[model samples]
Structure formats: C-alpha cells, structure tokens
Target: TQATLTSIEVSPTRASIAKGMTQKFTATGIFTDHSKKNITEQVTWKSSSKALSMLNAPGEEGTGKAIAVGNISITATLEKLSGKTDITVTPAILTSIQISPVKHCLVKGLTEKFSATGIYSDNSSKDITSAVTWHSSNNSVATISNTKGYQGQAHGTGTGTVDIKATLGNVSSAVSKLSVTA
Candidate 1:
C-alpha cells in the first residue's frame, strides 16, 4: 500500500490553559502518497472526543480550532482515502498525583469500588475537595459511580478498563489507569 495522509502543520505542539478556559488548537493536512495524490483534497475533519472540538470540511487540510479545559484529541478523517492525523493539547501545571483503589480488582457481577485522589505542591486538602473534578480516560470501560466515594462499575465480565483523573483549576494529576479481573 502506497498511501499517505497527514497534517501539514500543527501549531503549538504543546499548550497550557486553565480548567474552565478553552484551549485553541489548529491542524492542517497534506496528501503525500503519489498513488492518492488527490486524496488530501478529500480529508474529513474529526475530533476523537466531541467535548474537544467541533469539526469542519472533508479533503483539503484545514485549520480548525477547539476550546477545552482538559486534554484534547483532534483528528482528521478521510472517507474513502488514506489520510488521517491527530494532535494533543495539554494543560499548564506544576505538580499533581493520582491514587489507585484499595483492592484494584472488581468481582464478577458485583459492584466494584474504585476512586482516586490528587496531591499538588501548591494545593491544600480543602482545594482538592472544593476544586477537583474527575474524568474517565476511557468512559466505555469502567465508569466511576457518582455515588459513595465514587465507585467504578464494569459493563462486561471480560476485563474492566479505566483511567481515573483528577483536576484542580488548571493543574491535573497523572491518570490512575486501572483494570479489573473477574
């Protein structure tokens, strides 16, 4: 296969922003495969998470932007072609931490509890309680139950997958990635 699709340029490969503010990201693409020389003109713009950005156009790279407080994954898709690329937008912060659950395992057909907390160099425990909010790295995996210390539930019996994240203002802790066994 001699097909290629990619971004022409990614502005601000790295960026930082506050929790409630939006991070603007831009991406453009170009077709490089000689076989699909005209393919770049047919690229469809897409963002992995809708919460990241609103997309526009297909074929012909574009300079699209998204406003998100947390992490962002922007992607461009080609309907019947071979051209696609993505960019990551990060937040600005100095220090953060993520914790794992007690047992780190969930039983079959049973409610498993998984929760994570954060620690910051310049944050107080009160700040963590007041400003910290959680995001699931993989929402389809194991989701944090909104009840009782934030328990996590597995949708299937195969294996539970989840990444718990805590954010305070603009600072975010490392994701506490976890999986459960039957």
Candidate 2:
C-alpha cells in the first residue's frame, strides 16, 4: 500500500549550534489522507555546504554536525516529498572563567561559598559552578569542595592564603584568593 505524501515537515526549522556540536533533526511525512508518518530514517539528508555542516544518512539521518562557523541549509527528501531547515554554526571557544568573590577572608573552621561563570566566544556567560572542577592551592590552609553548593573551607588553625580555581573542558578560571585567620 502506497499513500501519496502530500508534504514533509522538519522539526527545528531553524537553529544555532556551536562548531563540533551535533543537532538532531526530525522529519514527518504528511499523507494525502491527512495522516503523518515518521520518515526520519527513510529520508535522504543533505547539507547545502559540506564545509559548514555535515548530514548523516539512514541509520543516523537528520543529524547535523557542525564543522565550521557558517550557515547552511539542510534538506530531507523522501521520494517526491522534501523538507528544508537552516542552521548556523558558531565558534565554540571558551573565552574566560570568572570566579565570584575575587578574594575572601574566612575564620578558622569556617567555610566560604564560591561560584564560577563561563564566558564563551559568543559573548554569553553562564553559571558553571557545579560543572567546573574545583581546586585549592593549599588544602591544609583552605580546602575546596567538589560537591554542589559549598566551595571550600578554612580548617581550624590553618592560617595562610590559598588560591582557588575551577576548571572545565581544559579551561581554567583565574585563581581566587582566600585568606585564612586562626
């Protein structure tokens, strides 16, 4: 039984992805009888510019992997029906990491809170406190917490200045100074 495909619709008509990032698209076929079918794996996926975006076929249909910073059109075709979408790939560069409370003084046996903000090439910033790995220059003086919420503590009688930093995906934040007092 073959029903005529009236039209094709693609999910995520437009999107923006970072270079090296992958975005999955979906295709639905509308039939003449007003029925819809999932034609994701049956459609032929193609990219307008291979340099900007690459489209995977059959087993991984509609998967657009960004290769460079540029815009490209993606089309999914199934027999006589087809659908198109646009995508823009942006550079995925970690600009910087900003640590909150640049400097702090904590009392013996007391703890302090800290946070990290990630700046990206798109000039956007996001809270990356939990996503980043925490480090303490001197654990004896001030230890950093890797878990959520808290950042670190100043052990009792541990008097010294410790440098704290956070890292994520090879990108490390500037050290924040923590002064300990007995």
Candidate 3:
C-alpha cells in the first residue's frame, strides 16, 4: 500500500585490504516504490568471520577492518533485508615492509616498540627496522631506535588519530595509524 523496504545492496561488491587496514563500505536501501538511499550507518554492519576480519568495530561505523590474512564476507542488515560484500585481506608487503602492531595507539602515553621488515621478490623477509626513521604524519609523536635494536621505539605524544609512519630513504611499508583500532 505504501513505500516499503524491499532490499538492500552493498557496494564495492568485491574488495581487497591489507592486513590491519580498513576500507569504507556503502549500503543502499531499495524500496518497493523504486527509491534508494544510503543506509550505511543506519544498518547493522557485520563480518562473516570475526577471526579474520571485522565490521562496525566500536568508533568506526560502516568500515571493515581486515585484521588477519584471510577473506571474509561483510554484510549490512536492516530489518529482514541484508546486503553482502566480499573482502580479502592480503598478508602485507611491498618492496615494501609491514609493521606487526599495524594499528596501535597510546591513549595516554607509554612506550611501545614497532618493527618494519621488507620482503623483495620472495617470501623470505628482511629486517629494516634499524635502518628506518620513525615519524607521525601529523607531526605528533616520538622517535625511532638507533641503538641497533632492530625496531622502532615509539613513545607516542598527544595526537588525535594521527598516522604513524616508518621510512627508509624513500620507501617503506604502508602507513600505520595510531587510531586505537584497525
């Protein structure tokens, strides 16, 4: 008799994300009257496998975080209607390195060590932590280790959701964020 929710569609139907990285998801609600609108945050976000990936984690709404090395199905639900999307989380690399605690934060100071390792052409990885420099894209954090410790020594300072970056010359891994969550 009137406009009603008929179905929901999630966009970016297929996607890939590096481990510990996040991607934004979009949800559209289609009505019986041929109308549609964004219902991303209004719907319930979910991940088919939380052990491999996650969705709607705390403060990050309509965002999926690939936490481990695997693939998962992300879904958005409203009432009895639901939409699905598939996401694959790549293991992490490049000429290219990847830090372990990829997404870490110090809500109120304290020291944490970060590591960077590069893998070139093969599956074997190399240690580049001691050869790199540590920094925050927002100019808001601590320094790296120089004592040949083979890791980045970060004692974060106050910054709001800033990006933590490790660099060696001009190349490094994907930027890490101190956003408390993936």
Task: Judging by lDDT against the true structure, name the best candidate.
Answer: 2
Relative to the unseen true structure, what is the C-alpha lDDT of residue 181 in candidate 2, on a scale of 0 to 100? 90
Off by over 4 Å in 2: 55-58, 93-164, 167-182
Better-scoring candidate (TM-score), 2 or 3: 2
RMSD per candidate (Å) reads 15.9, 9.1, 12.9
Please report the candidate that would top TM-score against the real structure: 2
lDDT by residue (34-136, candidate 1, tens digit) is 2323322344545566445543434224444434434555443554433233444344233564544523555445555443455423232233432456566
- Steric clashes per prediction: 5, 0, 0
Please identify model 3 stretches exceeding 4 Å from their true place.
55-59, 94-182
Encode model 2's per-residue lDDT on 119-178: one tens digit a residue.
Answer: 876556898887888888888888778755564332433898988888988889998888
Worst 10 contiguous positions by lDDT, candidate 1: 120-129
Q: How far is 108's C-alpha from truth in model 1 (Å)?
A: 4.1
What lDDT is reached at residue 47 by model 2? Answer: 88
Q: Judged by lDDT relative to the true structure, which candidate is superior, 1 or 2? A: 2
Candidate 3 residue pairs that clash: none
